[PDB]
Amino acid sequence: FTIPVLKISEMTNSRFPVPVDQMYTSRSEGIVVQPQNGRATIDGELLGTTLVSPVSVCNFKGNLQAEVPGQHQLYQLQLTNLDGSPIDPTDDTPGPLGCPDFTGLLYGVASQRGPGDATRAHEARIDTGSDTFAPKIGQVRFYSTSSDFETNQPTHFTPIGIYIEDFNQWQLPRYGGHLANNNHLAPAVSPLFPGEQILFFRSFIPGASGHTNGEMDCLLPQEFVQHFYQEAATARSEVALLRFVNPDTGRALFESKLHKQGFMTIASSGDHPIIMPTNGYFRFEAWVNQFYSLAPV
Amino acid sequence: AFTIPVLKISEMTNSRFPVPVDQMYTSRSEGIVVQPQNGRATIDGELLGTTLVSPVSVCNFKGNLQAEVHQLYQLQLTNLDGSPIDPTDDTPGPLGCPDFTGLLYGVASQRGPGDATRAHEARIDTGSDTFAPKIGQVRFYSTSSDFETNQPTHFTPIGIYIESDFNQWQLPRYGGHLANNNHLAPAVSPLFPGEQILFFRSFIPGASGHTNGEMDCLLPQEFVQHFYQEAATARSEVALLRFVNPDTGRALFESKLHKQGFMTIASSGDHPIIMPTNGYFRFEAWVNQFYSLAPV
């Protein structure tokens, strides 16, 4: 079994198409950690709405069906899957792969190519928390400060950041609209062993407006998802022991438990970033059980 | 031991622009020098040009909003990973720097003071005289004046703006109009008769005007990452590959993966290489540059 050699700064966030900024740990007090993107067993089984492509999460693609009545510069998208295939509500997923897994005002740019090679693009916002947001059945709407959009022309939404007018990275959206309950969701995760906390790979996504640190925590960097999908090595135990080492010194910095279901934990207490030498990276050490005792920090 | 990751064309990421690969494509490249700087990696694991491993960083910019030169701003670039720009590096420019000339359309965002944020459309003319990323000098025009001076700023790429036109094979002057490029990954071309380079093409978004946004890269970003990661020794100058249909069982065609980091096939003319969706490349054997490939 193996994990690719990568510095924190070479990692890609698996919940938003941007690099990882830092490792971070938390008590996650009063919160259910149940992301749907960046979900993969160390076995190579992708969960939730997780796809392998690292530049597709939070992107949308589909036909510009029409403009909603009354509301201006608010457009209705008829989604296809990001790879072009038609949206299939019968799939055993909460929603289309790469679909945002948080509630908030997603800021981005909607572009079109057509008729012919004619193109146009403008800022756009999609409220993943709005009642009408129903990507599971292909119904998604975006607001734009421009009316320069063609009806029935291929359209794509490129994500950028969050717009604050609120952004809740742990609040799952209703993939099927206000009249449907989510299903097929990757399970929530949490540390079960005393003194441990989940280790997150955090990024500060861009803010388009208002106040926000745009904190976005994912359980595994996208590269680990791709590697597990690719290797499909058998999990010899429920926990793969990793050890963060500093190639510069030869010094190892701390150990972490990579759980079979796809998340890491460390022996730590409180909400704080895990600051380490820039060239540090994780390496597989051995197979242990969930009772393995880790030294703090 | 050499290997290439199992991937469908639709699972591949373009190495010159942060978007998925749309299709394989081949060309005579008539009257054109193929010398991209991004997506450059020897099958040995040696990264060339301005190539980085991160798949979401190419064509992005980061730095301080130094000042206004009307709604034209001067950036004081840092490397994408935060480290200061170092012109002494043996690279043409900072890693991930665009390797084409044109009007790059995107969005410039800021966070600061405190957790205050703001973002607006922005354009960077990688062909403009002032464009000098090798020394950290880059400017962006925005239809908004809502930008803070001396606040961390980031440029997220999106597409091309057509008004100076997009030329995917014209390298920008990384050091500004008063300096010549250097440390450039070498140009590549097919040397064997009847062969042409096999490109991994994507249609990047158009922000305005007419354009198919064709962007051809020599290797999908995943192969760059894999070679960087494996660093397996090249037993010969050419790694023979086969594109197989897992559905059926048999080969569709063969391609030669050159040690320097580019592929060629036996083909003639400019056209897309259309194959069954589940098809993917696999390493077959080590051959020399004289290996004869069957057409198509």
Numbering used by the authors:
A (entry chain B): 227 to 391, 396 to 527
B (entry chain A): 226 to 294, 298 to 391, 395 to 527
Sentences from the paper on this structure:
Norovirus capsid displays an icosahedral symmetry that is composed of 180 copies of a single major structural protein, the capsid protein (VP1), which organize into 90 dimers. Each VP1 can be divided into two major domains, the N-terminal shell (S) and the C-terminal protruding (P) domains, linked by a short hinge. The P domain is further divided into P1 and P2 subdomains, forming the leg and the head of the protruding P dimer, respectively. Expression of the S domain alone formed smooth, thin-layer S particles without the protruding structures, while production of P domain in vitro resulted in P dimer, P particle, and small P particle. Functional analyses showed that the P dimer and the P particle, but not the S particle, bind to histo-blood group antigens (HBGAs), the host susceptible factors of noroviruses (see below), indicating that the P domain is the HBGA binding domain.
